[PDB]
């Protein structure tokens, strides 16, 4: 049987907070250094030279992977 009617109290207090970052916050990416490219030499069958900006070049990259490329003051 039923003796009474009542209002249903609850303690909903969240007072502790636990967040755990998902695994993909720490996953790797590829980052690069970025300079203004002063010029480019490409060679595979036929050598072709672009020149964007003419200055004494402080730095030079060489990359052989398919086409030979030289990135000047890259």
């Amino acid at each position: 049987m039923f003796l009474i009617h009542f209002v249903h109290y609850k303690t909903i207090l969240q007072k502790y907070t636990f967040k755990f970052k998902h695994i993909f916050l720490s996953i790797d990416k590829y980052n690069s250094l970025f300079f203004n490219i002063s010029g480019i030499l490409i060679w595979l069958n036929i050598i072709h030279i672009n020149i964007i900006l003419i200055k004494y070049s402080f730095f030079i990259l060489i990359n052989n992977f398919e086409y030979l490329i030289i990135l000047i003051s890259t």
Partner: peptide
Amino acid sequence: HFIKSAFTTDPLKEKQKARFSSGGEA
């Protein structure tokens, strides 16, 4: 553009010489 500039399929045009181009300031 890299391909068409650095590679040519007609091999009477191999070993010609170097070609020149320009970007923004030049």
